[PDB]
Amino acid sequence: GEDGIFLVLLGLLMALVSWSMDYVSAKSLQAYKWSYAQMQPSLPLQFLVWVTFPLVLILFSALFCHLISPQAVGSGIPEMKTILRGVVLKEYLTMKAFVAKVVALTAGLGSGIPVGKEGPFVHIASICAAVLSKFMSVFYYSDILTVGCAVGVGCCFGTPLGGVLFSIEVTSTYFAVRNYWRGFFAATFSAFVFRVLAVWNKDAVTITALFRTNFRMDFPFDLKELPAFAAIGICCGLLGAVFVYLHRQVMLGVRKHKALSQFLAKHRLLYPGIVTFVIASFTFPPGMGQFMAGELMPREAISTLFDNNTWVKHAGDPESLGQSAVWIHPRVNVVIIIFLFFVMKFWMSIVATTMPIPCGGFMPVFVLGAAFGRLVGEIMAMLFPDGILFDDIIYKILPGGYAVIGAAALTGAVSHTVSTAVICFELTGQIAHILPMMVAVILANMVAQSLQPSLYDSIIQVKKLPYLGWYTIFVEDIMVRDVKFVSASYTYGELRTLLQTTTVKTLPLVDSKDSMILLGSVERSELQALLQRHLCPERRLRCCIDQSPFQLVEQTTLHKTHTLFSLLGLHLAYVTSMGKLRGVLALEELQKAIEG
């Protein structure tokens, strides 16, 4: 209803902003390709531009990322998933930086450097949610955050149900069912709006998701290479685990040393782009895309990975097909260029997410997963090129399903989740390999549970951002040992002293100053309005207390005190004994306890 009006205005503006950003991204980067081709093939000058228009665009990006934004460098989802799990930072929830981030993200989005959209877009979507909530009540909190999360990811990719899942399944402990209905409503109306405008304005075809990967969908797998799918699970999780490890090996490499931070801060702004230099030194297409097919911006890259044809038998024919023509060097085998492509995008991608950019950890890992999938699909084409039979028709395999299941599996391994597979097929446009990708997602996730933590927990761990998860433990001396006193029986100056002596917003109220049994709470404005209604007749002059419930039992273990404030989601712990108040136990002290 009115809440539905809140959700639909949220989703409509969110879809407008997303359409605008990939509109600018597409036009900018096609102009990059345009000028790069059309000037002249000059080994000084095209190497000059193959460095420098990424280099202008990306020190331009980091310029906007760092100067205008006082704090919004390196933003994402884990800080706000910590916010909903307790640590509120209203200073980090500034309206002014939202607009300051997103255009920087557009310079991240129009780049050739593989970056992730999803994190900071979710962050600014929650910002938008809070802003419209601020506009509400002119015509609770973790609900707003959760709806913002779901709306953000589902309005990135037009994937409704996968987005509301990726809100729910990782960034929560318990969940209120109103907010899924809100998120489903808003998310599907958003993804509706996201696609229709790309036909009303500048045109997609009609109602594709993004991607139609027309497989044969008729005798697809078959069930003979099927346990080989088991193999295509396993090592993915292993490599995904390895990814986080070297990321931790560079999270240390974030700030292992201060002397190079000083040598940095001699001119601090300049940092990331130099390795952009060397990856440009590893990306130049008549330099190195001779061996790698470097002329692949990531969206068309994953589409050309998804081409429904066998490249062993397109090593059979040298026919210039569409963009898949870039997958040919005429001498050396294409499995080798896929191998080197994969590994160089890998030790490019760790640094690509390393640099001070607000970035999600999705887009490069799914590309590398898709690479791994099409590698092994083409070697399966190598091993049995004959194919198998059906009723007077010979059917041979096609590798794009292997690529799409791996492109689910690796980011499922990175983020310790499963809805990566749902948005995988819901982005794919066909649901052929659906049960193989969920089974392989299971296998990758259990291997990841076996070895390594998640991406974002390791991020907040090494960043030491305050949370944490869930012989001698003795827990009694944590409480805060002073609470104010109120009685309502008063004359003039006694009511004034109750106003003046106190500081905080709302007020706890006990039974008596001696018994100290807490009763309820008080607002100051009510007292002041009582003083108003008292004042109204003067110059020759002619709501019961809502109750605070509980007591903390003085030896409540860290796991179960953590569980206590988890279940409450509430402010304090008023500790009494025999009703006589003992103290107030708080949250950051429990964080200091869980440090041990």
By CB under 8 A, name the binding residues for a second copy.
4, 160-161, 169, 172-177, 180-181, 184-185, 188-189, 191-192, 195-196, 199, 205-207, 209, 212, 214, 217-223, 418, 422, 425-426, 429-431, 434-435, 438-439, 442, 446, 515, 517, 547, 549-551, 553, 555-556, 567, 578-579
Rounded Cα distance, 3 and 154, in Å: 19
DSSP 548: P
Q: Tell me the two tokens of residue 23.
A: 């509109």
Q: How far apart are CA 12 and CA 315, in angstroms?
A: 47
362 carries a ligand binding annotation: yes
| Distance from C-alpha of 78 to C-alpha of 455, rounded to nearest angstrom | 9
CA neighbor of 402 nearest in space, from 165, 206, 274, 213:
213
Q: How far apart are the first and last CA of the chain?
A: 48
Kindly tell me which of 226 and 530 has the beta carbon lying closer to a second copy: 226
How far apart are CB 219 and a second copy at their closest, in Å? Answer: 7
Nearest-approach distance from CB 19 to a second copy, in angstroms: 16
Q: Minimum distance from CB of 527 to a second copy (Å)?
A: 24
At 576, is the secondary structure helix, strand, or coil?
A: strand
Give the integer Cα–Cα distance in Å for 196 and 211.
15
Q: Which is nearer to a second copy, 37 or 176 (CB)?
A: 176
Between 6 and 180, whose beta carbon lies closer to a second copy?
Answer: 180
Please give the single-letter amino acid code of residue 492.
Answer: Y
CA gap 112, 109 in Å, rounded: 8
- 23 burial (CB, 10 Å; 0-12 / 13-18 / 19+) is middle
Angle between helix 226-251 and helix 363-383 axes, rounded to 10 deg: 140
Q: State the minimum distance, in angstroms, from the CB of residue 564 to a second copy.
A: 9
List helix spans (H) across 209-333. Answer: 226-251, 259-265, 273-281, 290-292, 298-305
Q: Which is nearer to a second copy, 114 or 160 (CB)?
A: 160
Of the pair 46, 561, the CB lying nearest a second copy is at: 561
C-beta of 112 vs 583, nearer to a second copy: 583
The two counts, helices (H) then strands (E), for the chain are 23, 6
Q: How far is the CB of 396 from a second copy (least distance, A)?
A: 15
> Smaller CB distance to a second copy: residue 222 or 477?
222
Nearest residue (CB) to a second copy, 39 versus 473:
473
Distance of CA 431 to the CA centre of its chain: 25
Residue 36 is labelled as binding a ligand? no
Inter-axis angle of helices 177-200 and 160-168, to 10 degrees?
150
Question: Which residues, 6 or more positions from 264, have their beta carbon under 8 angstroms from its beta carbon?
Answer: 271
Q: For the chain, what's the residue count?
A: 596
Q: Is residue 75 marked as binding?
A: yes
HSE value, Cβ hemisphere, 13 Å, CA-based, for 376: 22
Separation between Cα atoms, residue 388 and residue 402, nearest integer Å: 17
CB of 476 to a second copy, least distance (A): 13
Burial 456-475 (b: 16+ CB within 10 A, else e): bbbbbbeeeeebeeeeeeee
Question: Is 193 or 305 the residue whose CB approaches a second copy more closely?
Answer: 193
Give least dist CB 452 to a second copy, A: 17
Cα–Cα distances in angstroms (integers) from residue 286 to residues 43, 168, 208, 292, in the given order:
8, 46, 35, 10
Is the CB of 79 or the CB of 426 nearer to a second copy? 426
What is the C-alpha separation between 299 and 321, in angstroms, rounded?
A: 18
Nearer to a second copy, 71 or 214 (CB): 214
**CA-wise closest residue to 14 among 211, 268, 204, 186:** 186
CB of 558 to a second copy, least distance (A): 15
Whether residue 139 contacts residue 380, with contact meaning beta carbons closer than 8 Å, is answered with no
CB of 386 to a second copy, least distance (A): 18
Which residue numbers belong to the known binding site for chloride?
A: 75, 362, 456
Q: Enumerate the known binding-site residues.
A: 75, 362, 456
